[PDB]
Design a protein around this ligand. Structure first.
Ligand SMILES: N#Cc1ccc(COc2cccc(C3=CCN(Cc4nc5ccc(C(=O)O)nc5n4C[C@@H]4CCO4)CC3)n2)c(F)c1
Lengths: 193, 380, 338, 126, 57
């Protein structure tokens, strides 16, 4: 009889569809954070009762061109760095100028001079940001110069669909930047910008 | 002071003439002109050979100007009035009482064209949203519900427009149509007016629902999609029901006569105009908050982007409704309020055309869907 | 020994190129130009499956050609039913990115795997309760990209750490190990005898492998860019490969070289996933410019276009009897073509 | 197979210029954004410079800004790198490398875990 | 050093791929033509068929 097996199929279909509705609820409550500089480090935590599953990569063969392409659905790529700096600039340019990373806004972190970049002496320093007390003005100029280098590599054909956010080393700033990326993505949904 | 208040004062004088025909004592002589009412003057029981020089009644727009116009009708010695022929009416010297509408008809035409063009453009927009299916998101469900609200508002104004164009001045010219106009004020008048006001208030509440939903997706960022969509559907078709059903109960239990527009209470329109104006104020607050969010994200070229943002968001969440809410403060000054609200209703109802132009040309994903469908039709 | 070995290897590779040139007396198009083509074959969207949240990266048909396993990136393997547009089982995970999915040749086991290096095998019997990992095959050091069941007892896993290995289920260790590649490995396919198989590597070198040999038989260094697509011709002799350089170099094992290059001038984008039909004449390829262009096998003509999706396609399976073709794109839909 | 050959090498004095021609064949030269990657003894692989398919997008490493000159030959499918104002710490194995995908800008050849589209490399000892 | 080990494995791979036979490209194309002419009659998607046998209708 087709009727009994078809009714059982409808009942199982309704059960799996209610499971998919619960999964849709918990997935639209889920925000993802790719972290790069088992086989994956799923760091689960909540901030202000909002889910932020942070994902770090560990033991991986680092030809990144084949496993970055499965990260277009992420909300924010956290790109923390500290020669390593020039390779970080090249990797950030490759992430910024990929064909399928146009809708992924990259949160950028910094850490940590005259030999690696001899063009540092020809920089005009803005006083728009108040420095922390007890800091060398030369080190402050170098830090904001690294920020301006990442910003000029960002704005070099940035396409307007995603924007970088350089920061300096908490989690509250990560939450504020995730709110910023969500609100800018929804304003591009409603086309107000 | 116009023909609407003229016909209202005519209906009041008709009720007074019904009272007079209830209490009109004849004289003590059987040969007399009997009681009559030819729908222009309430003639009492007259005497033969007497020039009954009663004045023209106070419902006319010129009888208040010249109150000395005494209309004449001769009573013959056979119990009938002077007729002078059998083809015409009984003869009456009405030559002593002879001595805005075109602008009202022009307003009627321009909002008729506005609602018709908005109806056509939003049927097309609903066809786009139900045919492409890449536009099948939750905010697109909200926009489709708003477009359906505009379509039902166009249907409400089309079912209100029955004979308003061709009954423009035929009441005072032929009083058979004037008495039929008072017969037109029936339960169907109340039902059509209640449905139209219900759907206009529903359009305001769907504007509030879309504003609250957009502010929620910006600031709140907490949602369970099926329950939130069902709650917004329940609000968007429940609070117009919740403020129209007691409105109709107040109508049915407090109304004496008429079609219940501005009669005697201030509560009749206080119940219906407190939450709508409060909704317009909440929408203005949501507008100010969203504009501050856009200014914050823009400062964190400039004026052109801000102008494009506000000229996109005003057809979505209009401050023109706030301005016209701050213009037509009624306070029971409803004597010829038809112009006062039809200037509002004519300067509006282009908002459906504006949002149709927006969500059919300006939206880049919708334009990409048009280009994609054109490319697929070329490849087929 | 590096300089003289370098010169000897260059001389021997030039001898291989000269032997391929001597075998290449004429191209395949000039000798198969006399074949009258079938013509323009259009298709029509028949079904639309709506049960996904993230993008769809991989699908796989069944041997009954009635069921299919969909791999999303929310962590849910969803078994779809084709001709009744319904669902059978939904398989959850603790991870998210499911980079591969496979179906058993008898219809009893479903594989999965991603960056988490856990190749889980889900039984399709469900005796006591719901679905559950029977045994796990976590032995790789990189990631997992594509796996296909030979039989119900073992499965080969193309990994990302350059180590390809065959995995018996009940042992939990490597039965054999194939490390002949240099770069990453994206996809593989299986011949209909389930003995010989190939491996699409990311150094423009396709390698013929075998279980009983323990060593590669042939090597096809014909492409110019990385390879993201590879599939056998259904006789078990030839195989087509798809790369990102807008070409589809058709290869053959017994012909030792390439046969036909699908380099269209209006295509400057890559190829995602290729497959053949039951006959093998309809080259069903997955491109990057939002459509699946149907190509001819022997005449190299665009017989049709499959533009029913809205985003990048990632997987393209064909039924074992030529019934339907369901392409899984990044739009969270499964358009079934007929 | 993408065969890649270089030119030059040997012991050179600090300050003398030397050409670096990348003898490349087997592929369409006008559809890839090729680049240079050097490998110092005791240091990982690092990017040097690039040139686009047209020839406009030319960038350099921040330490060798202006002192190096990169140029490509579209007709004779080779890449001509010119070293000027040499420095004894800048000597390395100059690998002629190629970015993998056509008509794009993303490049992942800085990874030292055997990216198999780099050249065979020639040591230029400064 | 593992470079000499990779070099010896590459030499063994070259000898192992050089110790095989070579079959004609025209014979392979004739085999492909024979397979296509054999299975195009039974291919459902190639031949335009009515939707009665197709369960997707
Ligand atoms: N009695 C009578 C009568 C009928 C007809 C004529 C013919 O001459 C003229 C002259 C000028 C205007 C009119 C009009 C008549 C009926 N009107 C319908 C209508 N639409 C409305 C919208 C808002 C509001 C409001 O917010 O107050 N009220 C509305 N209303 C009125 C509501 C529905 C019941 O009262 C439209 C204009 N008619 C007459 F002389 C007396």
């Amino acid at each position: 009889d087709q009727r009994n097996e078809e009714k059982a199929q409808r009942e199982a279909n309704k059960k799996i569809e209610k499971q998919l509705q619960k999964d849709k609820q918990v997935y639209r409550a889920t925000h993802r954070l790719l972290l790069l500089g088992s086989g994956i480090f799923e760091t689960k935590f909540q901030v202000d009762k909002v889910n932020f599953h942070m994902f770090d990569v560990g033991a991986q063969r680092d030809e990144r061109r084949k496993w970055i392409q499965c990260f277009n659905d992420v909300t924010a790529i956290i790109f923390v760095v500290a020669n390593r700096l020039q390779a970080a600039l090249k990797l950030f340019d490759s992430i910024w100028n990929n064909k399928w990373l146009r809708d992924t806004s990259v949160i950028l972190f910094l850490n940590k001079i005259e030999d690696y970049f001899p063009e540092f002496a020809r920089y005009t320093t803005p006083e728009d940001a108040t420095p922390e007390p007890g800091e060398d003005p030369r080190v402050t100029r170098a830090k904001y110069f690294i920020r301006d280098e990442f910003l000029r590599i960002s704005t070099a054909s940035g396409d307007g669909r995603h924007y970088c956010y350089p920061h300096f080393t908490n989690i509250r700033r990560v939450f504020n930047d995730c709110r910023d990326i969500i609100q800018r993505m929804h304003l591009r949904q409603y086309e107000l910008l | 002071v116009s023909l609407w208040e003229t016909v209202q004062k005519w209906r009041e004088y008709r009720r007074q003439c019904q009272r007079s025909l209830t209490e009109d004592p004849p004289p003590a002589t059987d040969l007399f002109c009997n009681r009559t009412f030819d729908e222009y003057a309430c003639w009492p029981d007259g005497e033969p050979g007497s020039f009954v020089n009663v004045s023209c009644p106070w419902y006319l727009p010129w009888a208040s100007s010249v109150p000395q116009g005494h209309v004449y009708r001769f009573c013959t010695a056979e119990g009938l009035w002077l007729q002078k022929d059998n083809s015409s009416l009984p003869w009456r010297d009405l030559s002593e009482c002879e001595e805005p509408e075109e602008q009202l008809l022009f307003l009627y035409i321009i909002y008729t064209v506005g609602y018709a063009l908005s109806f056509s453009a939003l049927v097309i927009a609903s066809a786009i949203l139900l045919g492409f299916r890449h536009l099948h998101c939750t905010r697109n469900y909200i926009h489709l519900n708003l477009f359906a609200s505009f379509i039902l508002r166009a249907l409400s104004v089309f079912i209100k427009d029955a004979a308003l164009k061709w009954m423009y001045s035929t009441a005072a010219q032929q009083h058979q149509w004037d008495g039929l106009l008072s017969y037109q004020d029936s339960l169907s008048c109340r039902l059509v007016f209640l449905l139209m006001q219900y759907c206009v208030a529903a359009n305001y509440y769907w504007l509030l629902v879309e504003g609250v939903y957009l502010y929620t997706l910006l600031a709140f960022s907490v949602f369970s999609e099926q329950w939130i969509f069902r709650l917004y559907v329940s609000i968007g078709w429940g609070v117009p029901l919740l403020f129209v059903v007691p409105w109709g109960i107040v109508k049915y239990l407090y109304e004496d006569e008429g079609c219940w527009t501005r009669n005697s209470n201030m509560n009749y329109w206080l119940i219906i105009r407190l939450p709508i104006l409060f909704a317009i104020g909440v929408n203005f607050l949501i507008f100010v908050r969203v504009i501050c969010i856009v200014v914050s994200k823009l400062k964190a070229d400039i004026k052109c982007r801000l102008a494009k943002s506000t000229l996109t968001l005003i057809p979505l969440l209009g401050t023109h409704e706030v301005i016209f809410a701050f213009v037509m403060d009624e306070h029971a000054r409803g004597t010829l309020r038809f112009i006062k609200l039809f200037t509002e209703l004519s300067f509006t109802s282009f908002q459906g055309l504006m949002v149709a132009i927006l969500y059919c040309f300006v939206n880049n994903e919708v334009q990409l869907e048009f280009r994609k469908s054109w490319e697929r039709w070329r490849l087929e | 020994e590096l300089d003289q070995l370098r010169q000897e290897a260059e001389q021997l590779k030039n001898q291989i190129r000269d032997a391929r040139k001597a075998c290449a007396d004429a191209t395949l198009s000039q000798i198969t130009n006399n074949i009258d083509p079938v013509g323009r074959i259009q298709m029509r969207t028949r079904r639309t499956l709506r049960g996904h949240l993230a993008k769809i990266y991989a699908m796989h048909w069944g041997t009954d050609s009635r069921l299919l396993v969909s791999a999303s990136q929310d962590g849910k393997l969803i078994i779809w039913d084709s001709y009744t547009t319904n669902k059978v089982h939904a398989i959850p995970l603790r991870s998210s990115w499911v980079m591969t999915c496979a179906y058993a040749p008898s219809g009893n086991y479903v594989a999965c795997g991603g960056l988490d290096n856990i190749c889980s095998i889900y039984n399709l019997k469900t005796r006591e309760g719901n679905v559950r990992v029977s045994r796990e095959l976590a032995g790789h050091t990189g990631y997992l990209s594509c796996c296909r069941f030979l039989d119900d007892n073992q499965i080969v896993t193309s990994s990302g750490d350059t180590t390809c290995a065959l995995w018996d289920i009940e042992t939990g260790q490597q039965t054999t190990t194939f490390t002949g590649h240099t770069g990453d490995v994206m996809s593989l396919s299986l011949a209909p005898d389930t003995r010989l198989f190939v491996s699409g590597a990311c150094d423009a070198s396709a390698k013929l492998w075998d279980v009983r040999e323990g060593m590669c038989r042939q090597t096809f260094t014909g492409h110019e860019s990385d390879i993201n697509a590879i599939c056998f011709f259904p006789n078990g002799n030839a195989f087509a490969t798809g790369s990102d350089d807008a070409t589809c170099r058709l290869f053959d094992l017994r012909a030792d070289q390439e046969l036909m290059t699908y380099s269209h001038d209006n295509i400057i984008c890559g190829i995602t996933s290729v497959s053949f039909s039951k006959s093998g004449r309809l080259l069903l390829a997955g491109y990057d410019d939002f459509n699946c262009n149907v190509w001819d096998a022997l005449k190299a003509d665009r017989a049709g276009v499959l533009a029913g999706h809205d985003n990048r396609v990632s997987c393209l399976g064909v039924t074992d009897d030529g019934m339907a073709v369901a392409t899984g794109s990044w739009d969270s839909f499964l358009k079934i073509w007929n | 197979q993408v065969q890649l050959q270089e030119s030059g090498g040997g012991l050179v004095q600090p300050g003398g210029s030397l050409r670096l021609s990348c003898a490349a064949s087997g592929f369409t030269f006008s559809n890839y954004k090729m680049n240079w990657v050097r490998q110092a003894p005791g240091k990982g692989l690092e990017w040097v410079s690039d040139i686009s398919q047209s020839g406009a997008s030319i960038s350099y490493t921040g330490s060798v800004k202006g002192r190096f000159t990169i140029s490509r030959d579209n007709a004779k499918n080779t890449l001509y790198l010119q070293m000027n104002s040499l420095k004894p710490e800048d000597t390395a194995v100059y690998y002629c490398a190629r970015c993998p995908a056509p008509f794009t800008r993303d490049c992942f050849d800085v990874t030292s875990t055997t990216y198999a589209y780099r050249g065979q490399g020639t040591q230029v000892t400064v | 050093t593992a470079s000499i080990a990779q070099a010896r494995k590459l030499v063994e791979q070259l000898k192992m791929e050089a110790n095989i036979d070579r079959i004609k490209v025209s014979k392979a194309a004739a085999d492909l033509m024979a397979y296509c002419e054999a299975h195009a009659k039974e291919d459902p998607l190639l031949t335009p068929v009515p939707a009665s046998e197709n369960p997707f209708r």
